[PDB]
Design a protein around this nucleic acid. Structure first.
Ligand code: MG
Ligand code: MG
Ligand code: MG
Ligand code: MG
Ligand code: MG
Ligand code: MG
Ligand code: MG
Ligand code: MG
Ligand code: MG
Ligand code: MG
Ligand code: MG
Ligand code: MG
Ligand code: MG
Ligand code: MG
Ligand code: MG
Ligand code: MG
Ligand code: MG
Ligand code: MG
Ligand code: MG
Ligand code: MG
Ligand code: MG
Ligand code: MG
Ligand code: MG
Ligand code: MG
Ligand code: MG
Ligand code: MG
Ligand code: MG
Ligand code: MG
Ligand code: MG
Ligand code: MG
Ligand code: MG
Ligand code: MG
Ligand code: MG
Ligand code: MG
Ligand code: MG
Ligand code: MG
Ligand code: MG
Ligand code: MG
Ligand code: MG
Ligand code: MG
Ligand code: MG
Ligand code: MG
Ligand code: MG
Ligand code: MG
Ligand code: MG
Ligand code: MG
Ligand code: MG
Ligand code: MG
Ligand code: MG
Ligand code: MG
Ligand code: MG
Ligand code: MG
Ligand code: MG
Ligand code: MG
Ligand code: MG
Ligand code: MG
Ligand code: MG
Ligand code: MG
Ligand code: MG
Ligand code: MG
Ligand code: MG
Ligand code: MG
Ligand code: MG
Ligand code: MG
Ligand code: MG
Ligand code: MG
Ligand code: MG
Ligand code: MG
Ligand code: MG
Ligand code: MG
Ligand code: MG
Ligand code: MG
Ligand code: MG
Ligand code: MG
Ligand code: MG
Ligand code: MG
Ligand code: MG
Ligand code: MG
Ligand code: MG
Ligand code: MG
Ligand code: MG
Ligand code: MG
Ligand code: MG
Ligand code: MG
Ligand code: MG
Ligand code: MG
Ligand code: MG
Ligand code: MG
Ligand code: MG
Ligand code: MG
Ligand code: MG
Ligand code: MG
Ligand code: MG
Ligand code: MG
Ligand code: MG
Ligand code: MG
Ligand code: MG
Ligand code: MG
Ligand code: MG
Ligand code: MG
Ligand code: MG
Ligand code: MG
Ligand code: MG
Ligand code: MG
Ligand code: MG
Ligand code: MG
Ligand code: MG
Ligand code: MG
Ligand code: MG
Ligand code: MG
Ligand code: MG
Ligand code: MG
Ligand code: MG
Ligand code: MG
Ligand code: MG
Ligand code: MG
Ligand code: MG
Ligand code: MG
Ligand code: MG
Ligand code: MG
Ligand code: MG
Ligand code: MG
Ligand code: MG
Ligand code: MG
Ligand code: MG
Ligand code: MG
Ligand code: MG
Ligand code: MG
Ligand code: MG
Ligand code: MG
Ligand code: MG
Ligand code: MG
Ligand code: MG
Ligand code: MG
Ligand code: MG
Ligand code: MG
Ligand code: MG
Ligand code: MG
Ligand code: MG
Ligand code: MG
Ligand code: MG
Ligand code: MG
Ligand code: MG
Ligand code: MG
Ligand code: MG
Ligand code: MG
Ligand code: MG
Ligand code: MG
Ligand code: MG
Ligand code: MG
Ligand code: MG
Ligand code: MG
Ligand code: MG
Ligand code: MG
Ligand code: MG
Ligand code: MG
Ligand code: MG
Ligand code: MG
Ligand code: MG
Ligand code: MG
Ligand code: MG
Ligand code: MG
Ligand code: MG
Ligand code: MG
Ligand code: MG
Ligand code: MG
Ligand code: MG
Ligand code: MG
Ligand code: MG
Ligand code: MG
Ligand code: MG
Ligand code: MG
Ligand code: MG
Ligand code: MG
Ligand code: MG
Ligand code: MG
Ligand code: MG
Ligand code: MG
Ligand code: MG
Ligand code: MG
Ligand code: MG
Ligand code: MG
Ligand code: MG
Ligand code: MG
Ligand code: MG
Ligand code: MG
Ligand code: MG
Ligand code: MG
Ligand code: MG
Ligand code: MG
Ligand code: MG
Ligand code: MG
Ligand code: MG
Ligand code: MG
Ligand code: MG
Ligand code: MG
Ligand code: MG
Ligand code: MG
Ligand code: MG
Ligand code: MG
Ligand code: MG
Ligand code: MG
Ligand code: MG
Ligand code: MG
Ligand code: MG
Ligand code: MG
Ligand code: MG
Ligand code: MG
Ligand code: MG
Ligand code: MG
Ligand code: MG
Ligand code: MG
Ligand code: MG
Ligand code: MG
Ligand code: MG
Ligand code: MG
Ligand code: MG
Ligand code: MG
Ligand code: MG
Ligand code: MG
Ligand code: MG
Ligand code: MG
Ligand code: MG
Ligand code: MG
Ligand code: MG
Ligand code: MG
Ligand code: MG
Ligand code: MG
Ligand code: MG
Ligand code: MG
Ligand code: MG
Ligand code: MG
Ligand code: MG
Ligand code: MG
Ligand code: MG
Ligand code: MG
Ligand code: MG
Ligand code: MG
Ligand code: MG
Ligand code: MG
Ligand code: MG
Ligand code: MG
Ligand code: MG
Ligand code: MG
Ligand code: MG
Ligand code: MG
Ligand code: MG
Ligand code: MG
Ligand code: MG
Ligand code: MG
Ligand code: MG
Ligand code: MG
Ligand code: MG
Ligand code: MG
Ligand code: MG
Ligand code: MG
Ligand code: MG
Ligand code: ZN
Lengths: 100, 64, 107, 149
RNA sequence: ACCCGGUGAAAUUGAACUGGCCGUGAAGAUGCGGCCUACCCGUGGCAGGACGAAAAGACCCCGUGGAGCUUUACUGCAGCC
RNA sequence: GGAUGACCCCAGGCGGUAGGGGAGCGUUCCCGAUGCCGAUGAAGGCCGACCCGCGAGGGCGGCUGGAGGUAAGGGAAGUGC
RNA sequence: GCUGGGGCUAGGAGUGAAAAGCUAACCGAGCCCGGAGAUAGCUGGUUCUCCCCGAAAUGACUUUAGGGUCAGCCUCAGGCG
RNA sequence: CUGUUGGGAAGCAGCGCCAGAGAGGGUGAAAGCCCCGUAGGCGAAAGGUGGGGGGAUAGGUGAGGGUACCCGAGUACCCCGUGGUUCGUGGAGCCAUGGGGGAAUCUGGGCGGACCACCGCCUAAGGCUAAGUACUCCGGGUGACCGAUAGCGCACCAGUACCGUGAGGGAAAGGUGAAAAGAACCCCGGGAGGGGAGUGAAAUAGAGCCUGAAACCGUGGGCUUACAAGCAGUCACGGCCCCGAGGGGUUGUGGCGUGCCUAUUGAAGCAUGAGCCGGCGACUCACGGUCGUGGGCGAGCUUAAGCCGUUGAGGCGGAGGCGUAGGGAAACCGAGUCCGAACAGGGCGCAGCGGCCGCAAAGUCCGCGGCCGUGGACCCGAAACCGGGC
RNA sequence: GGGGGGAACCUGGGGAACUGAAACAUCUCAGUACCCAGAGGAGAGGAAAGAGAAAUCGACUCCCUGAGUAGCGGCGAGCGA
RNA sequence: AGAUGGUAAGGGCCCACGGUGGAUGCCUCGGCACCCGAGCCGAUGAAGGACGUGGCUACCUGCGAUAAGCCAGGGGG
């Protein structure tokens, strides 16, 4: 119930964003950084980036404003700790399966 | 370590559905020849232990 | 196993921090146990000496004070810029320091 | 909603009682223990659930009753649990011991006995026993009692 | 022992600005009442008091505390039959 | 009264040992924190006749000190002599 | 008789011209370490603040009597009214 | 990289850049980019390991029929004495065996709680056997672990000094500064010590070194005190001194006034404890229970060990537990049941709110708090008892 | 080939008492403390003359659970498959 | 006749500065806990020691009359 409510809380604030895939991010921080900017993440707000894509996680993991997770790892402290929630659809799929 | 059930209590007493404690009337183990029939008969029933005493016995029976 | 020294006697170093920031000089000495280098004419101090056979007339001498090695940067002999050092393997294949700005050996 | 906002509801986290910490607390000095005697001592009294100051206890003066069992212990015999018709309300078609275990009605390792509280429902109910009134309600409602053995 | 030079402890010590009487007070008061007496601070001396110091009374009792000892206390063991 | 613990008004209670209960203060540590305060001076110390608080305390100022400290809200205890 | 040197006998054990003497400055059972944080119904001590309430020193029973169990008496929460 | 303040930049400011690396530690203060690192990678001639891969070797493998040769001996078995098991002599079997007696070879033997029968289970008196398990002298990683009275007894040359014949006991004791630049030389002094000079951002950072509290000792100043009666204060007024219709310090006179803690019926008590100061110093934790409480789900609630994942990420796991029915010594019956001849009497039991929806709830899980049980269980203290040694 | 050492761990051979039972003897503490032997990186155990009711299971070891159940017990304290 | 002030041997309170002392804060070479890793040595004389050993050497470390070290492989610069 908690997992769900936390996501719900961000959803209700508009702070939850689902994404189809990640453009050019192939493991480089500058690559993620580009994409991120382009997606409205200027790094002025902390992001819990959740995706099963290892290449996208490495690329984002060193950013001070980004916390990264595999979808199996999603948990409420991390959601609540960060200002903005960003998910793969595939990530979002498992979370739906998890809160079922 | 877990509490142990007190075996003298388990052997003398029963906790009823609503948690009263029930035991056999004392006093007809012996010396009964001169006891009336009203006496022997009445001592043949169960009685309900006085609240504070039952309450203590109940705590010795943690898993009934 | 050995202290890592990025600088040596007597390549030419920039002193990048402290009172003498900006100075350039040869490394007269490297003291690895103390993690320190002596740079020529950098960090001068006035030491008192007793009137002694070694120093009659007594008074004072100037000594070079050691610098924490991290304050010091080798200057590349090719480009003349202060640099971080990289390692490059030769064909030998001995390894050597090379400037990190251009690719020049530092010896 | 953020980490600074996470709060337990009022009363969810009460402070502990600390004794032996000064006069203002009103639990200083004796630490609410009163003065002297066994109960104030470290280690305290005997099991106040039982012991009564040396006189024979309330418990030990009451008669033992019934079969207390002997080595080598409990005699293995089949065990029955009753579930009433009313608990069968929720099912359609067939009920068997196994389904009833799953519903969290029948405990494992007990036999099924159907009992009479409630109404019968035209179901095929398979069990190890039925009460007189269960059989009656069940036959009458056009359900089908099936004995197992 | 005393005085002067040298060196320099101790137990004890709630703090003290620490008198007498007659009373009072947990029943023997420098510390309370009323009176009496009394300028400040020492040195050598005396031992009546500070229920002076030392030692959580050794007597006495209490503890379902200990220990040594005894016996036709109880129960056991060695040993002996 | 107003709607709700905003605060105003009227009335009444408020000696206290064992002890029950309530509300708080402060100490170490964790999340808050890749943050924030900090050599134009951390903690700590010494002053203060000032400010807030019933109080435990908390501020502010001066001097010392010379490198750390750590909010609102929560969490946990080797927490107050 | 006294005495040097070299030896032997010890803990419920030695040794004792006998005092329960002596067995490394306290022996009616040596010392060390361990069980061990023995047990202590006894004595002592028990540390910040404010606020409300507020006892008992009785009865019964008790190898009990300065200790307990229950009850009486205090306090909190819920209900009744 | 530059500028700036500064003894020092890593602070502040300007303009950049890396990131599979923004873990962390250093560098004169506070640094992703200066140093050491970190992510990601790479590496053994020699010794060790090698539970993985490969190979070899030892070793392994039939069916009727007949025969009735073999199938673990002071053994089974029975009795006596004991131990082990939950079993304390119990109806006491089983496993083991100190004593006595003492077999059989499958038509043999042991077992299923005395014994007997029946029905089954298993093959004693020879041996070995990885792994899953325990531990931590050793190496490493990590802490809502300590931070020099703490943390190991020991941060330091400590099982040391010292104590003890011995076994054995067993301490204290960390910090100049960024850098020794650790104060040349002069002056007083035998020296120690100091005063200058000098170094340093700072020297009441000068080595008897960061900070430098308190008790304690002193110098200097303000007020006060030699006719006064005292738990040492307090209230009032006045004098003097200080900072500037107010405060502060001081205290002459007048009023009032029996220390603190402890224990007690009752203490200032001539009853306990305390010389003073600083530091250490006593109601906790686990597991169970009981109530209360904050939530989740609710005829249901919940998982344990483990497994997968993570590397401060969670999930899976339903075995099991509590609840859903009670009554009865039990057989047993069951919204009843027990006593009883009883269709008697009795004991103990059984029976939400609103508009199918929502709300509440049995119950149960988790958190929190009070108290209880088991543990040393609030801390400190015996005299003693026992083991092994000296 | 042995001998001797090794912090815990392990098996085997021996094996207390305080304490608890609010006294105490059976009982408890506890097969613990401790002594001894032996191993080893583990040790032990291990391939049914088993379990025990299922017409079943299938060496041993270790964890969870079964379960504070069954029982044991001056049927006390407690002990506990 | 009356009445009132300056005495301080010394003492008391307050303020300033020191001395003594080593609290407090900060610090950490060390400790602690858990987890992982790893786990026997010895007659080829162990564990653990004694005495030695430096040009000058009290101690510690290291080492053994070949004595702060000898030979060789690897690493490193
Ligand atoms: Mg990040
Ligand atoms: Mg963050
Ligand atoms: Mg009777
Ligand atoms: Mg009788
Ligand atoms: Mg009878
Ligand atoms: Mg009879
Ligand atoms: Mg008659
Ligand atoms: Mg009668
Ligand atoms: Mg009659
Ligand atoms: Mg149960
Ligand atoms: Mg029940
Ligand atoms: Mg290198
Ligand atoms: Mg420059
Ligand atoms: Mg090379
Ligand atoms: Mg708490
Ligand atoms: Mg208090
Ligand atoms: Mg209270
Ligand atoms: Mg009170
Ligand atoms: Mg007190
Ligand atoms: Mg007490
Ligand atoms: Mg109390
Ligand atoms: Mg209490
Ligand atoms: Mg008390
Ligand atoms: Mg009392
Ligand atoms: Mg007391
Ligand atoms: Mg008492
Ligand atoms: Mg009491
Ligand atoms: Mg006590
Ligand atoms: Mg105790
Ligand atoms: Mg006690
Ligand atoms: Mg009696
Ligand atoms: Mg039973
Ligand atoms: Mg049908
Ligand atoms: Mg003279
Ligand atoms: Mg003299
Ligand atoms: Mg005084
Ligand atoms: Mg006087
Ligand atoms: Mg009188
Ligand atoms: Mg008198
Ligand atoms: Mg007087
Ligand atoms: Mg007075
Ligand atoms: Mg008087
Ligand atoms: Mg008077
Ligand atoms: Mg007089
Ligand atoms: Mg005199
Ligand atoms: Mg006298
Ligand atoms: Mg005298
Ligand atoms: Mg006196
Ligand atoms: Mg006297
Ligand atoms: Mg006396
Ligand atoms: Mg005295
Ligand atoms: Mg004493
Ligand atoms: Mg006495
Ligand atoms: Mg006495
Ligand atoms: Mg006597
Ligand atoms: Mg007496
Ligand atoms: Mg006596
Ligand atoms: Mg007695
Ligand atoms: Mg008594
Ligand atoms: Mg006695
Ligand atoms: Mg005795
Ligand atoms: Mg004889
Ligand atoms: Mg009022
Ligand atoms: Mg009131
Ligand atoms: Mg009043
Ligand atoms: Mg009051
Ligand atoms: Mg209240
Ligand atoms: Mg409270
Ligand atoms: Mg606050
Ligand atoms: Mg505090
Ligand atoms: Mg607090
Ligand atoms: Mg911490
Ligand atoms: Mg942080
Ligand atoms: Mg920080
Ligand atoms: Mg700033
Ligand atoms: Mg500065
Ligand atoms: Mg300043
Ligand atoms: Mg701090
Ligand atoms: Mg602080
Ligand atoms: Mg203050
Ligand atoms: Mg300050
Ligand atoms: Mg720092
Ligand atoms: Mg904080
Ligand atoms: Mg906070
Ligand atoms: Mg929180
Ligand atoms: Mg404490
Ligand atoms: Mg002789
Ligand atoms: Mg001799
Ligand atoms: Mg002799
Ligand atoms: Mg002899
Ligand atoms: Mg001897
Ligand atoms: Mg001996
Ligand atoms: Mg003895
Ligand atoms: Mg004797
Ligand atoms: Mg003895
Ligand atoms: Mg003798
Ligand atoms: Mg003689
Ligand atoms: Mg005599
Ligand atoms: Mg001796
Ligand atoms: Mg002697
Ligand atoms: Mg004795
Ligand atoms: Mg002696
Ligand atoms: Mg020993
Ligand atoms: Mg013990
Ligand atoms: Mg203890
Ligand atoms: Mg005793
Ligand atoms: Mg306390
Ligand atoms: Mg009142
Ligand atoms: Mg009385
Ligand atoms: Mg009474
Ligand atoms: Mg009577
Ligand atoms: Mg009674
Ligand atoms: Mg009393
Ligand atoms: Mg008593
Ligand atoms: Mg009571
Ligand atoms: Mg009343
Ligand atoms: Mg009420
Ligand atoms: Mg400058
Ligand atoms: Mg710069
Ligand atoms: Mg910048
Ligand atoms: Mg990282
Ligand atoms: Mg960092
Ligand atoms: Mg860092
Ligand atoms: Mg500096
Ligand atoms: Mg910063
Ligand atoms: Mg910082
Ligand atoms: Mg850095
Ligand atoms: Mg790596
Ligand atoms: Mg690496
Ligand atoms: Mg054949
Ligand atoms: Mg044959
Ligand atoms: Mg055979
Ligand atoms: Mg044989
Ligand atoms: Mg036998
Ligand atoms: Mg036995
Ligand atoms: Mg029996
Ligand atoms: Mg048996
Ligand atoms: Mg035999
Ligand atoms: Mg056969
Ligand atoms: Mg046969
Ligand atoms: Mg047999
Ligand atoms: Mg047999
Ligand atoms: Mg049989
Ligand atoms: Mg069998
Ligand atoms: Mg069998
Ligand atoms: Mg074997
Ligand atoms: Mg294997
Ligand atoms: Mg194994
Ligand atoms: Mg391990
Ligand atoms: Mg380690
Ligand atoms: Mg620290
Ligand atoms: Mg220290
Ligand atoms: Mg220490
Ligand atoms: Mg310190
Ligand atoms: Mg150590
Ligand atoms: Mg030390
Ligand atoms: Mg030493
Ligand atoms: Mg001695
Ligand atoms: Mg000695
Ligand atoms: Mg000793
Ligand atoms: Mg000490
Ligand atoms: Mg330093
Ligand atoms: Mg230094
Ligand atoms: Mg000179
Ligand atoms: Mg001279
Ligand atoms: Mg000098
Ligand atoms: Mg001078
Ligand atoms: Mg000088
Ligand atoms: Mg200067
Ligand atoms: Mg400055
Ligand atoms: Mg200073
Ligand atoms: Mg300083
Ligand atoms: Mg000092
Ligand atoms: Mg410093
Ligand atoms: Mg200082
Ligand atoms: Mg000083
Ligand atoms: Mg001072
Ligand atoms: Mg003066
Ligand atoms: Mg006069
Ligand atoms: Mg006068
Ligand atoms: Mg006055
Ligand atoms: Mg007036
Ligand atoms: Mg004034
Ligand atoms: Mg005045
Ligand atoms: Mg005044
Ligand atoms: Mg007046
Ligand atoms: Mg007085
Ligand atoms: Mg009075
Ligand atoms: Mg007081
Ligand atoms: Mg006292
Ligand atoms: Mg007393
Ligand atoms: Mg008395
Ligand atoms: Mg009295
Ligand atoms: Mg007095
Ligand atoms: Mg008196
Ligand atoms: Mg007195
Ligand atoms: Mg006395
Ligand atoms: Mg007194
Ligand atoms: Mg007394
Ligand atoms: Mg003393
Ligand atoms: Mg003092
Ligand atoms: Mg103190
Ligand atoms: Mg408690
Ligand atoms: Mg609880
Ligand atoms: Mg609860
Ligand atoms: Mg839930
Ligand atoms: Mg609900
Ligand atoms: Mg349970
Ligand atoms: Mg009925
Ligand atoms: Mg009825
Ligand atoms: Mg609930
Ligand atoms: Mg309770
Ligand atoms: Mg314990
Ligand atoms: Mg305890
Ligand atoms: Mg407790
Ligand atoms: Mg003790
Ligand atoms: Mg003795
Ligand atoms: Mg004895
Ligand atoms: Mg004895
Ligand atoms: Mg002994
Ligand atoms: Mg002995
Ligand atoms: Mg051997
Ligand atoms: Mg061996
Ligand atoms: Mg054994
Ligand atoms: Mg043997
Ligand atoms: Mg044995
Ligand atoms: Mg053994
Ligand atoms: Mg013995
Ligand atoms: Mg005993
Ligand atoms: Mg004990
Ligand atoms: Mg007990
Ligand atoms: Mg006893
Ligand atoms: Mg006792
Ligand atoms: Mg006795
Ligand atoms: Mg006993
Ligand atoms: Mg015990
Ligand atoms: Mg035993
Ligand atoms: Mg042991
Ligand atoms: Mg051995
Ligand atoms: Mg292993
Ligand atoms: Mg093995
Ligand atoms: Mg083996
Ligand atoms: Mg076999
Ligand atoms: Mg169960
Ligand atoms: Mg019983
Ligand atoms: Mg046992
Ligand atoms: Mg005059
Ligand atoms: Mg004066
Ligand atoms: Mg004078
Ligand atoms: Mg005065
Ligand atoms: Mg000072
Ligand atoms: Mg700190
Ligand atoms: Mg090893
Ligand atoms: Mg050796
Ligand atoms: Mg040596
Ligand atoms: Mg070589
Ligand atoms: Mg080489
Ligand atoms: Zn270059």
């Amino acid at each position: 119930k908690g997992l769900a409510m936390a996501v719900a809380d961000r959803a209700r604030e508009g702070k939850l964003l689902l994404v189809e895939a990640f453009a050019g991010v192939n493991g480089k921080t500058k690559e993620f950084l580009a994409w991120a900017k382009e997606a409205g993440l200027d790094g002025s707000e902390s992001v819990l980036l959740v995706t099963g894509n290892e290449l996208v996680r490495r690329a984002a993991r060193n950013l001070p404003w980004v916390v990264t997770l595999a979808p199996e790892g999603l948990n409420v402290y991390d959601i609540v700790r960060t200002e903005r929630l960003v998910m793969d659809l595939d990530a979002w799929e498992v979370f739906q399966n998890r809160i079922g | 370590p877990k509490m142990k059930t007190h075996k003298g209590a388990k052997k003398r007493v029963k906790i009823t559905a609503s948690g009263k404690v029930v035991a056999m009337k004392t006093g007809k183990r012996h010396l009964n020849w001169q006891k009336s029939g009203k006496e022997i008969r009445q001592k043949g029933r169960k009685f309900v232990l006085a609240k504070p005493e039952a309450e203590r016995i109940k705590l010795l029976l943690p898993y009934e | 196993m050995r202290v890592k020294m990025h600088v040596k006697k007597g390549d030419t170093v920039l002193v990048a921090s402290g009172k003498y920031k900006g100075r350039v000089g040869k490394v007269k000495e490297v003291l690895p146990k103390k993690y320190a280098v002596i740079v020529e004419g950098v960090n001068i101090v006035k030491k008192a000496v007793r009137v002694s056979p070694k120093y009659p007339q007594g008074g004072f001498i100037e000594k070079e004070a050691p610098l924490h090695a991290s304050k010091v940067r080798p200057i590349c002999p090719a480009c003349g810029k202060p640099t971080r050092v990289r390692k490059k393997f030769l064909e030998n294949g001995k390894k050597i320091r090379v400037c990190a700005k251009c690719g020049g050996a530092l010896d | 909603m953020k980490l600074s906002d996470l709060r337990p509801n009022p009363g969810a986290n009460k402070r502990r009682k600390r004794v032996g910490r000064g006069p203002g607390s009103g639990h200083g000095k004796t630490a609410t223990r009163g003065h002297k005697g066994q109960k104030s001592r470290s280690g305290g009294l005997k099991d106040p659930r039982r012991f009564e100051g040396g006189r024979s206890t309330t418990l030990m003066r009451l008669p033992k009753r019934g079969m207390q069992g002997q080595v080598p212990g409990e005699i293995k015999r089949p065990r029955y649990q009753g579930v009433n018709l009313k608990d069968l309300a929720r099912f359609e078609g067939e009920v068997t011991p196994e389904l009833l275990v799953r519903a969290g009605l029948l405990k494992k390792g007990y036999r099924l006995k159907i009992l009479g509280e409630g109404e019968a429902k035209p179901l095929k109910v398979v069990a190890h026993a039925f009460s007189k009134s269960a059989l009656e309600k069940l036959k009458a409602a056009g359900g089908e009692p099936v004995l197992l053995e």
